[PDB]
């Protein structure tokens, strides 16, 4: 009952982290609108979960997002939380093999989708004293190899969260982000499958955390429910869900030349 | 039922933040041992709360802490979480009006109490796959005026949390910290009362947050319950409970000379 | 003679921070190519400074940037350092008064100009074991009010710096950023002049630093010369030139409701 | 001539990082007082360097430090910069194999020496508008395995730097810190020699940086000269001299259990 009577929109909710967030909010007593550009996972998740419904919506298409918000209000009468999870991490990219246009397209997906839904939702979040939860990444904070465009998008989302938190604080709307590290999801599995030795890639991903495993969508989901339902004095924070990957020395490459 | 069947020790649990943490854990279904050097608040809190008991214990006295742990195990059979909250913030201190011996004494209270209880508890936390929650302060991260010794103690606790998280990760024990900013507590009230204009001091404390208010012990308590019960992929994190005080420009003091 | 025999490109070098960086590098013994979209300041700066020349170049126009690099190599025979300073901070913008297209255009200027010049320069920087210096902003790290798009661009630049530092480390090319806070420049003066009380805006900008003043272009310039010429074990750092603005509590807005 | 006419005290200046800092300041034109508890290296360094002198002084002995300051003023007439470098990193320590008394002793050396010299020097630094440079460590920020006491001391020094920067800002005295990562020094060599495979320990230390090498005392020295002589708008900063060790994923330890 932690979030009973509340209405939550989760983008990219059809699989992976987003589906974990959907499940966590349903378990907390909320009604959830699952947004995804792909029907397959999200439609099944509506059938499975009483209290969740699915709306086909590509966050890069502003009229899809306008309809997502208007339909949420028409069907459920209020909006308390938006979780901006839709996004993508490309395969490894050497800097010289990226392009400005590819970078613009990744910004469109990973940064401007979040911007667009947040802007359309905010009038309703002000009415409910609701909150925004943005998914970013640990790599926005610490960098990553072979991911210049992706890392830039994560740095932008984390910073944008802080700016919007300042702007919406007089209106009672909190804005926070979750920065996952390595979470085992279909995207992780798909990216590993492109590598010459998928098994070694997965093992390396596990051992990047002091805990020696990757995280689960359910763990990101619990962090989101905390931010929405109980973190009433938290705004503009970056909640790390990383298993300690940012801690200590690790293998990153006369002794001093 | 989020933390049902678990046993939690909260130091400095007799009033303020610590009492808020005690209440949050009892509400989650845990049994709580309240440690405090003062009988007054903690004894009343035992009488009030089914599931909480009080043990008189000064965290700077190592034999008090040894008995705290042995009595917790004797009475309740397990130990799942220690919350190291006991500590003190002095009134404003100009750097030249501090002393090395006063600094040692503040380290003894604010840093070594945490160290001692954590060390004595860890064998039992390993058995239960339990966790450590250290209270630090935002000022460890950003500094504060007229508080050189206090700020150093907070910086030490936050860093120590990360080191111990690394060391205990192979044993399944998570170690995290909460960094509050301005939380309205008896200590805040007592410190304000020493100022020439207590009301103006309190108002300044409120306006240090974009949210325009101070936080509550219950809000720190909810963050602690999250870290203990649901943050299974979080270790070595610093969870800010600060109302946005670290965000944006504020009043800190030709245009460029 | 700290950077004698070296060749440096500074974008937005015609006034403000960029001109301060140009002057610092000339004083260190380097030859400097001043890039700016405006002829006025940069042309005068070429006439003033032996060792600096001016090339008209808008960093958002990829063929301008290609010619900037090819002309630098044709005229001077090597390239050791690029300083990505060109960019803009808009006047205050409420979140609901921004647009996705305006945000894309600010990303084009503040993020993709840096990306484009860096990509074109890197083959030459690899030959010279040179380095990249990106100008970002403190507000990328801490947020700012009424600046969602700008803050996002700064967060992106700082993060991108870290990613590229990782990628170029095996090739001996360091990539660092400087995050200024409040630096007194023509842009600061122009923005203040748009406010209802310019004098009060300037005073507030000065008092945002514990030092009680804004910084100077020459101070950013000295930080850039350090990063280029002497910081041989620094890569992926964010060097704050902020006068302490990020430190301590300040004015950001019952006591706890 | 960058720091000509200035007087600098460097503690632990007889070897390692401290000796690199001494050399950098002498090369900048300053007169340097080398403090060390051991005569061997520091006495030789006085004979070698015109402009450096050696004073035997253990920073944990407050009367040694009082005499260090009084002798500096008696002999040279002013004091412009103190570099608090003296300290020690123990061999690896499991948390359960540390003691409160050992922790107090390490705090005495690594934190309170810095506190004591800074306090005694500050009246003279106010007269000269001088500055304080504290050596800390990257591990204060990110943690390290098998080093709970050391990490706590580094976290304390970094935080203390920020607090004192706030307090001394109205008096024109800047206070900054340098956080080295892995610097090849006699201490590093001695610690490696205690390991079962010293060569493998050294190689692991080198590969902890994306740059693939450890840093040099001269590189820390150049950072110190920058902070003293040219960083006039920097106060309360943590200048990382780490070769990128904090960046990206590395080896820190079903895929998600
Ligand atoms: N998995 C990790 O380790 C990890 C780490 C840090 C950040 N992230 C981020 O978290 C988010 C989820 O990651 P994941 O691993 O679950 O990915 P995933 O690919 O498994 O799931 C992403 C979901 O979002 C949907 N989606 C993609 N583009 C969309 C669009 N334009 N409009 C609407 N829906 C869209 C997909 O169809 C899919 O159902 C992503 O933004 C990712 O970048 C993931
Ligand atoms: N209130 C804030 O804004 C704030 C902000 C950041 C950090 N903190 C820290 O949080 C903790 C709680 O703060 P608070 O405001 O609730 O303080 P408080 O003084 O109101 O409560 C502290 C409690 O700890 C007990 N205690 C003190 N020394 C002890 C010892 N030696 N052994 C056992 N118990 C001891 C006290 O008797 C009291 O019941 C402190 O460590 C404080 O430094 C407080
Ligand atoms: N002044 C501050 O307090 C401050 C703080 C943080 C960051 N910054 C950033 O530092 C940089 C310099 O700031 P400033 O205050 O000196 O600004 P400024 O406007 O005074 O100077 C900017 C210079 O860059 C040039 N420029 C702008 N767009 C360009 C383009 N497309 N191509 C080439 N040149 C271009 C301008 O013509 C001008 O000469 C900017 O990126 C700004 O966002 C400034
Ligand atoms: N080497 C690294 O990788 C590294 C990394 C981060 C921080 N640090 C810190 O930097 C400092 C220098 O490290 P190093 O590797 O050069 O060490 P080092 O042991 O080689 O040199 C330390 C010097 O300080 C002196 N010293 C020690 N205790 C003293 C005391 N009580 N009073 C006066 N002088 C004293 C020693 O005699 C010696 O000459 C230390 O504080 C260390 O913790 C070192
Ligand atoms: O595909 C990898 C993992 O993705 C997660 O989102 C699913 O919940 C898991 O069942 C699956 O193993
Ligand atoms: O004394 C200030 C505040 O302290 C808190 O710990 C109590 O819960 C409040 O009731 C009280 O107003
Ligand atoms: O316009 C504000 C300031 O801009 C700086 O770039 C110039 O160097 C100053 O002379 C001027 O006062
Ligand atoms: O002992 C390791 C290294 O220590 C440094 O301080 C010295 O400058 C080097 O010559 C030496 O190789
Ligand atoms: Na359903
Ligand atoms: Na009870
Ligand atoms: Na010229
Ligand atoms: Na000499």
Say how many CB pairs under 8 Å bridge C and D.
102
Contact C244, D235 (CB under 8 A): yes
Contact D256, B172 (CB under 8 A): no
3-state secondary structure of C242: coil
Query: Is C167–A157 a contact, with Cβ atoms under 8 angstroms apart?
Result: no
Distance from CA of B148 to the nearest CA of C (A): 12
Give the C-alpha separation, A215 to A180, whole Å.
8
Report the atom number in ligand 3 closest to the C-alpha of C60: 31
- Integer angstrom CA distances of residue C165 from A154, B186, C169, D114: 16, 48, 6, 33
Q: Taking each helix axis from N to C terminus, what angle separates A148-168 and A100-107, rounded to the nearest 10 degrees?
A: 40
Q: Which residues line ligand 2 (CB under 6 A)?
A: B 11-12, 14-18, 35-38, 41, 58-60, 85-89, 109, 135, 137, 180, 182-183, 185-188
B20 CA → ligand 2 middle, Å: 11
Report the atom number in ligand 7 closest to the C-alpha of C217: 6
Both tokens of residue A134?
A: 């943005």
* CB contact A187 to D (< 8 Å): no
What is the layout of strands, in order, in the sheet containing D174-180?
D52-56, D31-36, D7-11, D81-84, D131-135, D174-180, D238-241
Give the C-alpha separation, A63 to A72, whole Å.
14
Give the C-alpha separation, B225 to B230, whole Å.
8
Both tokens of residue B179?
A: 């960094």
Locate breaks in chain B with C to N over 2.5 A; list the residue preceding each.
Answer: 253
Listed in sequence order, the residues at least 6 apart from A123 whose beta carbon sits closer than 8 Å to its beta carbon are none
Q: Is the CB of D189 under 6 A from ligand 8?
A: yes
B147 CA → ligand 8 middle, Å: 38
Beta bridge partners of residue C201, listed in sequence order? none
Chain B residues inside the 8 Å CB shell of C16:
none
Query: Is B151–D140 a contact, with Cβ atoms under 8 angstroms apart?
Result: no
The catalytic residues of B are: 150
Burial class (CB in 10 A: 0-12, 13-18, 19+), B7: buried
C12 CA → ligand 7 middle, Å: 14
Q: Which residues of C155-191 are buried (b: 16+ CB within 10 A; e: fewer)?
A: bbbbbbbbbbbbbbbeebbbbbbbbbbbbbbebbeeb
Give the C-alpha separation, B54 to B41, whole Å.
10
H helical segments located in chain D: 16-27, 39-48, 62-76, 100-107, 113-128, 138-142, 148-168, 186-193, 198-207, 217-229
Chain B residues inside the 8 Å CB shell of D119:
95-96, 98
Q: Is the CB of B11 under 6 A from ligand 6?
A: no
Give the C-alpha separation, C81 to C128, whole Å.
9
Distance from CA of D140 to the nearest CA of A (A): 10
Q: Taking each helix axis from N to C terminus, what angle separates C113-128 and A100-107, rounded to the nearest 10 degrees?
A: 130
Q: What is the CATH number of the domain that holds A106?
A: 3.40.50.720
This structure was determined by X-ray
Strand pairing report for B131-135 and B174-180:
parallel
Chain C residues inside the 8 Å CB shell of D171:
none
Give the C-alpha separation, A112 to A134, whole Å.
12
Q: Which residues surround ligand 12, an ion (CB under 5 A)?
A: D 46, 52
Give the C-alpha separation, A147 to C163, whole Å.
7
Both tokens of residue D210?
A: 């994306």
* CB contact D170 to B (< 8 Å): yes
User: Which chain A residue has its CA at the smallest distance from D139's CA?
Assistant: A248
Q: Is the CB of C17 under 6 A from ligand 3?
A: yes
Contact C46, C34 (CB under 8 A): yes
- Integer angstrom CA distances of residue C220 from C184, C215, D224: 11, 8, 17
The catalytic residues of A are: 150
Phi-psi region of D210 (alpha: psi -120 to 50; beta: other; left: phi over 0): alpha
The H or E element that residue C58 is part of is none
Contact C95, C148 (CB under 8 A): yes
* CB contact C109 to A (< 8 Å): no
Provide the 8-state DSSP code for D254. Answer: -
D150 is catalytic: yes
Give the C-alpha separation, B131 to B80, whole Å.
6
Neighbors of chain C with 3 or more C-beta pairs under 8 Å: A, B, D
Q: Which residue has the tokens 């960058």?
A: D2
DSSP 3-state helix, strand, coil percentages of chain A (rounded to 5)? 50, 15, 35
Listed in sequence order, the residues at least 6 apart from C249 whose beta carbon sits closer than 8 Å to its beta carbon are B144, B145, B181, B182, B208, B245, B250
Give the C-alpha separation, A111 to C107, whole Å.
11
Q: Which of B19, B45, B183, B186 to mutate to test the pocket of ligand 6 (most atoms within 8 A of CB)?
A: B186
Nearest residue to D201 (alpha-carbon basis) of D217, D188, D210, D212? D188
Q: Is the CB of A190 under 6 A from ligand 5?
A: no
Both tokens of residue C5?
A: 């025999």
Q: Into how many domains does chain D fold?
A: 1
Q: Is the CB of A219 under 6 A from ligand 5?
A: no
Distance from CA of B128 to the nearest CA of A (A): 16
Query: Is B223–A243 a contact, with Cβ atoms under 8 angstroms apart?
Result: no
Neighbors of chain B with 3 or more C-beta pairs under 8 Å: A, C, D
Residues 188-217 of D with CB under 8 A from A: 188, 202, 204-216
Provide the 8-state DSSP code for C215. Answer: B
User: Could you list the residue range(s) of the whole structural domain that residue D123 is in?
Assistant: 1-257
The data reach a resolution, in angstroms, of 1.2
Taking CA atoms only, the protein residue closest to ligand 6 atom 9 is B185
Listed in sequence order, the residues at least 6 apart from A5 whose beta carbon sits closer than 8 Å to its beta carbon are A29, A30
Both tokens of residue B253?
A: 């003091």
Query: Is A248–B211 a contact, with Cβ atoms under 8 angstroms apart?
Result: no
Contact D56, D68 (CB under 8 A): no
Query: Is B208–C250 a contact, with Cβ atoms under 8 angstroms apart?
Result: yes
Burial class (CB in 10 A: 0-12, 13-18, 19+), B194: exposed
Both tokens of residue D60?
A: 């944990």
* CB contact D5 to A (< 8 Å): no
* CB contact A154 to C (< 8 Å): yes
């Amino acid at each position: 009952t932690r979030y009973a009577g509340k209405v939550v929109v989760v983008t990219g909710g059809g699989r992976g982290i987003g589906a974990g967030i959907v499940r966590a909010f349903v378990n907390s007593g909320a009604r959830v609108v699952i947004c995804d550009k792909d029907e397959s996972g999200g439609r099944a998740l509506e059938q499975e979960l009483p209290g969740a419904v699915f709306i086909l919506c590509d966050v890069t298409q502003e009229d899809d997002v306008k309809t997502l918000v208007s339909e949420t209000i028409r069907r459920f009468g209020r909006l308390d939380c938006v979780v901006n999870n839709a996004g993508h991490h490309p395969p490894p990219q050497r800097p010289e093999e990226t392009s400005a246009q590819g970078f613009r397209q990744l910004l469109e997906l990973n940064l401007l989708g979040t911007y667009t839904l947040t802007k359309l939702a905010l009038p309703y979040l002000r009415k409910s004293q609701g909150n925004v939860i943005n998914i970013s990444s640990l790599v926005g904070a610490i960098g990553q190899a072979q991911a210049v465009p992706y890392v830039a998008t994560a740095g932008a989302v984390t910073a944008m969260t802080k700016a919007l938190a300042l702007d919406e604080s007089p209106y009672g709307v909190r804005v926070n982000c979750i920065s996952p590290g390595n979470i085992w999801t279909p995207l992780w599995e798909e990216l590993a499958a492109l590598m010459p030795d998928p098994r070694a890639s997965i093992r390396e991903g596990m051992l990047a955390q002091p805990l020696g495993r990757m995280g689960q969508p359910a763990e990101v989901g619990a962090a989101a429910v905390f931010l929405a339902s109980e973190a009433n004095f938290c705004t503009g924070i970056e909640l790390l869900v990383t298993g300690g990957a940012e801690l200590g020395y690790g293998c990153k490459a006369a002794p001093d030349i």
